[PDB]
Amino acid sequence: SRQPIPSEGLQLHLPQVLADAVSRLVLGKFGDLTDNFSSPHARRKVLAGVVMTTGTDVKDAKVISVSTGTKCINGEYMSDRGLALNDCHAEIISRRSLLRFLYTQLELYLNNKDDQKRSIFQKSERGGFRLKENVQFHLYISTSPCGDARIFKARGQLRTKIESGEGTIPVRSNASIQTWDGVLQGERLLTMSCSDKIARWNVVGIQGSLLSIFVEPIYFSSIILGSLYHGDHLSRAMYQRISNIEDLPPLYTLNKPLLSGISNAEARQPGKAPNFSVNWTVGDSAIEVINATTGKDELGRASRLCKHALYCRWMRVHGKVPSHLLRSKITKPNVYHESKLAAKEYQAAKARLFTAFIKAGLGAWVEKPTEQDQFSLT
Ligand SMILES: O=P(O)(O)O[C@H]1[C@H](OP(=O)(O)O)[C@@H](OP(=O)(O)O)[C@H](OP(=O)(O)O)[C@@H](OP(=O)(O)O)[C@H]1OP(=O)(O)O
Ligand SMILES: [Zn+2]
């Protein structure tokens, strides 16, 4: 149960070598960012990060993102303008940080011929852009992701974080529908567990809907845990529970990344979990520190990771991409929600995912109130 589970796809690095390297690189970068772990912000329960490799040489690995955090937003603090982070579990934050890197990389491709050489993207013959060959991303988490991977209840079942609650709880037998006004009045906000979000990324990709208008689906090649690694539980949680998925749109797949623990596993530590979450993306001068309860920084400023900020980045790319090179038509992007819906193939993939969970007996995905996404840029 402690042996690595091979990827069912490509695998270009020795598993245990890759696992130890990515875990070392993420920890090292986090130390660098926290003044050799001396910052108040070095205090963490869970550390996560993303490492990129190019080709076969593990020496070339580059840390893309580093994050911490174990909490989510208080329901009263939901933003209807995209200004608040909903979910500050480290692994979730590390993906959003990766998104910024992806926007930057598209901008390098689009800027000019010289910046273009540095980009990890190439033109796709199918339209838009795709990764250069053998560019891979690897997810590191210092412990097993919450929900199905950690809890071992029913094997593979969907589970939610619940506001101000520890751990996760099963999804109900009848599909739960959240409402803006119900949450404001005191219904506790539910957020899908990290196990469930990563399984989601193993179908719809890590890039999200908006980025899929520009690029082909991108998947993690590896998921590396720094503690509580159990191959069989993790393989079920990360993909196998939804092997029943069908009718995926073009380029989507049920991704089955390498799964591995590390040679020197961490221990469970005592202490109250920090209420904050650190994030950093390669290229950033410093970490950003977010209060998990409000989803904003300590001064009430919006995160560089918030919906609004990501949409700002997306809009900037949208103005640079010739219409005929988009993967999905979107002439005059306005409301955030509607722009996401323009990613038609991604939405179809998401629907196949939701159906897979339901049909497998694992419950129904619990979505946010729609009002979160009903905003435009000024
Ligand atoms: O990083 P996450 O916290 O997991 O955020 C995601 C993400 O939303 P944003 O990128 O707008 O913050 C998803 O968007 P996609 O790129 O996958 O489209 C969205 O899914 P929808 O597209 O269905 O809105 C999902 O929202 P939901 O909770 O309704 O599943 C939401 O997760 P959180 O709401 O938990 O932040
Ligand atoms: Zn989690």
PDB file of C-alpha atoms in Angstrom, residues 165-299:
ATOM      1  CA  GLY A 165     -16.440  22.342  10.359  1.00  0.00           C
ATOM      2  CA  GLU A 166     -13.432  20.072  10.697  1.00  0.00           C
ATOM      3  CA  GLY A 167     -12.897  17.392   8.074  1.00  0.00           C
ATOM      4  CA  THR A 168     -15.524  16.550   5.481  1.00  0.00           C
ATOM      5  CA  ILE A 169     -19.044  15.085   5.458  1.00  0.00           C
ATOM      6  CA  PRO A 170     -20.702  12.839   2.833  1.00  0.00           C
ATOM      7  CA  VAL A 171     -22.903  14.375   0.161  1.00  0.00           C
ATOM      8  CA  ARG A 172     -26.607  13.719   0.985  1.00  0.00           C
ATOM      9  CA  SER A 173     -28.680  10.997  -0.726  1.00  0.00           C
ATOM     10  CA  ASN A 174     -30.840  13.670  -2.354  1.00  0.00           C
ATOM     11  CA  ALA A 175     -28.779  16.202  -4.383  1.00  0.00           C
ATOM     12  CA  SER A 176     -28.081  19.361  -2.401  1.00  0.00           C
ATOM     13  CA  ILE A 177     -28.823  22.701  -4.082  1.00  0.00           C
ATOM     14  CA  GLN A 178     -27.176  25.718  -2.468  1.00  0.00           C
ATOM     15  CA  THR A 179     -28.769  29.139  -2.590  1.00  0.00           C
ATOM     16  CA  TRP A 180     -27.317  32.619  -2.037  1.00  0.00           C
ATOM     17  CA  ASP A 181     -30.114  33.725   0.273  1.00  0.00           C
ATOM     18  CA  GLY A 182     -30.213  30.369   2.157  1.00  0.00           C
ATOM     19  CA  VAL A 183     -26.472  30.574   2.875  1.00  0.00           C
ATOM     20  CA  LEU A 184     -26.681  34.246   3.923  1.00  0.00           C
ATOM     21  CA  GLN A 185     -29.430  33.300   6.427  1.00  0.00           C
ATOM     22  CA  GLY A 186     -27.298  30.595   7.976  1.00  0.00           C
ATOM     23  CA  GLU A 187     -27.330  27.433   5.828  1.00  0.00           C
ATOM     24  CA  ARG A 188     -23.717  26.283   6.144  1.00  0.00           C
ATOM     25  CA  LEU A 189     -21.775  26.632   2.887  1.00  0.00           C
ATOM     26  CA  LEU A 190     -20.609  23.360   1.334  1.00  0.00           C
ATOM     27  CA  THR A 191     -17.431  23.066  -0.818  1.00  0.00           C
ATOM     28  CA  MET A 192     -16.408  19.894  -2.654  1.00  0.00           C
ATOM     29  CA  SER A 193     -13.537  18.012  -0.937  1.00  0.00           C
ATOM     30  CA  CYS A 194     -10.018  18.181  -2.396  1.00  0.00           C
ATOM     31  CA  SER A 195     -10.198  14.453  -3.323  1.00  0.00           C
ATOM     32  CA  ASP A 196     -13.262  15.299  -5.431  1.00  0.00           C
ATOM     33  CA  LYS A 197     -11.736  18.426  -6.991  1.00  0.00           C
ATOM     34  CA  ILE A 198      -8.583  16.528  -8.031  1.00  0.00           C
ATOM     35  CA  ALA A 199     -10.700  13.732  -9.578  1.00  0.00           C
ATOM     36  CA  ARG A 200     -12.520  16.534 -11.404  1.00  0.00           C
ATOM     37  CA  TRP A 201      -9.171  17.883 -12.692  1.00  0.00           C
ATOM     38  CA  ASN A 202      -8.363  14.361 -13.863  1.00  0.00           C
ATOM     39  CA  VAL A 203     -11.267  14.669 -16.334  1.00  0.00           C
ATOM     40  CA  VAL A 204     -11.820  18.340 -17.232  1.00  0.00           C
ATOM     41  CA  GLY A 205      -8.106  19.196 -16.838  1.00  0.00           C
ATOM     42  CA  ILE A 206      -6.408  21.557 -14.396  1.00  0.00           C
ATOM     43  CA  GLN A 207      -6.773  24.653 -16.588  1.00  0.00           C
ATOM     44  CA  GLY A 208     -10.452  25.449 -15.933  1.00  0.00           C
ATOM     45  CA  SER A 209     -13.166  26.569 -18.356  1.00  0.00           C
ATOM     46  CA  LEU A 210     -11.864  30.043 -19.303  1.00  0.00           C
ATOM     47  CA  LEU A 211      -8.353  28.862 -20.217  1.00  0.00           C
ATOM     48  CA  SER A 212      -9.835  26.031 -22.332  1.00  0.00           C
ATOM     49  CA  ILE A 213     -11.089  28.732 -24.738  1.00  0.00           C
ATOM     50  CA  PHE A 214      -7.375  29.281 -25.539  1.00  0.00           C
ATOM     51  CA  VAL A 215      -5.602  25.930 -24.834  1.00  0.00           C
ATOM     52  CA  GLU A 216      -6.209  22.183 -25.007  1.00  0.00           C
ATOM     53  CA  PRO A 217      -6.875  20.338 -21.714  1.00  0.00           C
ATOM     54  CA  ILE A 218      -3.844  20.061 -19.407  1.00  0.00           C
ATOM     55  CA  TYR A 219      -3.521  17.321 -16.744  1.00  0.00           C
ATOM     56  CA  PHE A 220      -1.210  16.579 -13.827  1.00  0.00           C
ATOM     57  CA  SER A 221       1.294  13.834 -14.652  1.00  0.00           C
ATOM     58  CA  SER A 222       1.870  13.014 -10.997  1.00  0.00           C
ATOM     59  CA  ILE A 223       0.270  13.413  -7.585  1.00  0.00           C
ATOM     60  CA  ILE A 224       2.875  13.201  -4.833  1.00  0.00           C
ATOM     61  CA  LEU A 225       1.890  12.955  -1.110  1.00  0.00           C
ATOM     62  CA  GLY A 226       4.276  13.856   1.740  1.00  0.00           C
ATOM     63  CA  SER A 227       2.330  11.756   4.254  1.00  0.00           C
ATOM     64  CA  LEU A 228      -0.604   9.340   4.594  1.00  0.00           C
ATOM     65  CA  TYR A 229       0.040   7.808   1.164  1.00  0.00           C
ATOM     66  CA  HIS A 230      -2.090   4.674   0.516  1.00  0.00           C
ATOM     67  CA  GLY A 231      -1.954   3.601  -3.113  1.00  0.00           C
ATOM     68  CA  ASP A 232      -5.296   1.783  -3.296  1.00  0.00           C
ATOM     69  CA  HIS A 233      -7.342   4.428  -1.546  1.00  0.00           C
ATOM     70  CA  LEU A 234      -5.617   7.196  -3.460  1.00  0.00           C
ATOM     71  CA  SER A 235      -6.065   5.503  -6.869  1.00  0.00           C
ATOM     72  CA  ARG A 236      -9.808   5.072  -6.189  1.00  0.00           C
ATOM     73  CA  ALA A 237     -10.129   8.688  -5.019  1.00  0.00           C
ATOM     74  CA  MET A 238      -8.106  10.260  -7.822  1.00  0.00           C
ATOM     75  CA  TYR A 239      -9.640   8.435 -10.784  1.00  0.00           C
ATOM     76  CA  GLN A 240     -10.709   4.818 -10.579  1.00  0.00           C
ATOM     77  CA  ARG A 241     -14.066   5.526  -8.898  1.00  0.00           C
ATOM     78  CA  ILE A 242     -15.189   7.235 -12.121  1.00  0.00           C
ATOM     79  CA  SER A 243     -13.846   4.718 -14.668  1.00  0.00           C
ATOM     80  CA  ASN A 244     -17.557   4.533 -15.736  1.00  0.00           C
ATOM     81  CA  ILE A 245     -17.304   7.988 -17.373  1.00  0.00           C
ATOM     82  CA  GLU A 246     -18.342   8.095 -21.035  1.00  0.00           C
ATOM     83  CA  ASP A 247     -18.803  10.225 -24.126  1.00  0.00           C
ATOM     84  CA  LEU A 248     -16.066  12.692 -23.352  1.00  0.00           C
ATOM     85  CA  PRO A 249     -15.630  15.569 -25.847  1.00  0.00           C
ATOM     86  CA  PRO A 250     -12.508  15.691 -28.058  1.00  0.00           C
ATOM     87  CA  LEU A 251      -9.140  15.817 -26.210  1.00  0.00           C
ATOM     88  CA  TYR A 252     -10.600  15.034 -22.768  1.00  0.00           C
ATOM     89  CA  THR A 253      -9.628  11.804 -21.015  1.00  0.00           C
ATOM     90  CA  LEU A 254      -9.816  10.125 -17.608  1.00  0.00           C
ATOM     91  CA  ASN A 255      -6.297  11.029 -16.564  1.00  0.00           C
ATOM     92  CA  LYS A 256      -4.499   8.510 -14.338  1.00  0.00           C
ATOM     93  CA  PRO A 257      -1.319  10.214 -13.096  1.00  0.00           C
ATOM     94  CA  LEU A 258       1.598   8.616 -11.304  1.00  0.00           C
ATOM     95  CA  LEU A 259       0.747   8.366  -7.566  1.00  0.00           C
ATOM     96  CA  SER A 260       3.550   8.283  -5.022  1.00  0.00           C
ATOM     97  CA  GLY A 261       4.598   8.953  -1.436  1.00  0.00           C
ATOM     98  CA  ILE A 262       8.038  10.302  -0.521  1.00  0.00           C
ATOM     99  CA  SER A 263      11.053   8.570   0.995  1.00  0.00           C
ATOM    100  CA  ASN A 264      10.971  10.559   4.251  1.00  0.00           C
ATOM    101  CA  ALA A 265       7.257  11.000   5.059  1.00  0.00           C
ATOM    102  CA  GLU A 266       6.039  13.778   7.336  1.00  0.00           C
ATOM    103  CA  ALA A 267       4.227  13.237  10.641  1.00  0.00           C
ATOM    104  CA  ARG A 268       0.894  14.532  11.979  1.00  0.00           C
ATOM    105  CA  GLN A 269       1.634  17.701  13.982  1.00  0.00           C
ATOM    106  CA  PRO A 270      -0.173  19.155  17.026  1.00  0.00           C
ATOM    107  CA  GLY A 271      -1.315  22.774  17.060  1.00  0.00           C
ATOM    108  CA  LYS A 272      -4.337  24.752  15.960  1.00  0.00           C
ATOM    109  CA  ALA A 273      -4.390  25.054  12.161  1.00  0.00           C
ATOM    110  CA  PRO A 274      -3.565  28.550  10.793  1.00  0.00           C
ATOM    111  CA  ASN A 275      -6.569  30.600   9.628  1.00  0.00           C
ATOM    112  CA  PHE A 276      -4.475  31.919   6.721  1.00  0.00           C
ATOM    113  CA  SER A 277      -3.288  30.593   3.368  1.00  0.00           C
ATOM    114  CA  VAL A 278      -0.035  31.503   1.583  1.00  0.00           C
ATOM    115  CA  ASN A 279       0.273  31.548  -2.240  1.00  0.00           C
ATOM    116  CA  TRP A 280       3.054  32.224  -4.751  1.00  0.00           C
ATOM    117  CA  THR A 281       3.531  31.758  -8.481  1.00  0.00           C
ATOM    118  CA  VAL A 282       6.917  31.708 -10.204  1.00  0.00           C
ATOM    119  CA  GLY A 283       7.729  35.272 -11.240  1.00  0.00           C
ATOM    120  CA  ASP A 284       6.137  36.781  -8.108  1.00  0.00           C
ATOM    121  CA  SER A 285       8.378  38.819  -5.750  1.00  0.00           C
ATOM    122  CA  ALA A 286       6.741  37.490  -2.618  1.00  0.00           C
ATOM    123  CA  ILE A 287       3.985  35.403  -1.084  1.00  0.00           C
ATOM    124  CA  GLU A 288       0.450  36.703  -0.746  1.00  0.00           C
ATOM    125  CA  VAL A 289      -1.302  35.906   2.546  1.00  0.00           C
ATOM    126  CA  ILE A 290      -5.077  35.370   2.560  1.00  0.00           C
ATOM    127  CA  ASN A 291      -7.472  35.086   5.493  1.00  0.00           C
ATOM    128  CA  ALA A 292      -9.399  31.833   4.775  1.00  0.00           C
ATOM    129  CA  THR A 293     -12.541  33.044   6.601  1.00  0.00           C
ATOM    130  CA  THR A 294     -12.983  36.187   4.493  1.00  0.00           C
ATOM    131  CA  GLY A 295     -11.205  34.957   1.324  1.00  0.00           C
ATOM    132  CA  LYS A 296      -9.323  38.285   1.240  1.00  0.00           C
ATOM    133  CA  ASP A 297      -6.010  39.602   2.547  1.00  0.00           C
ATOM    134  CA  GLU A 298      -5.638  41.043   6.083  1.00  0.00           C
ATOM    135  CA  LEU A 299      -6.474  44.539   4.742  1.00  0.00           C
TER     136      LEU A 299
END
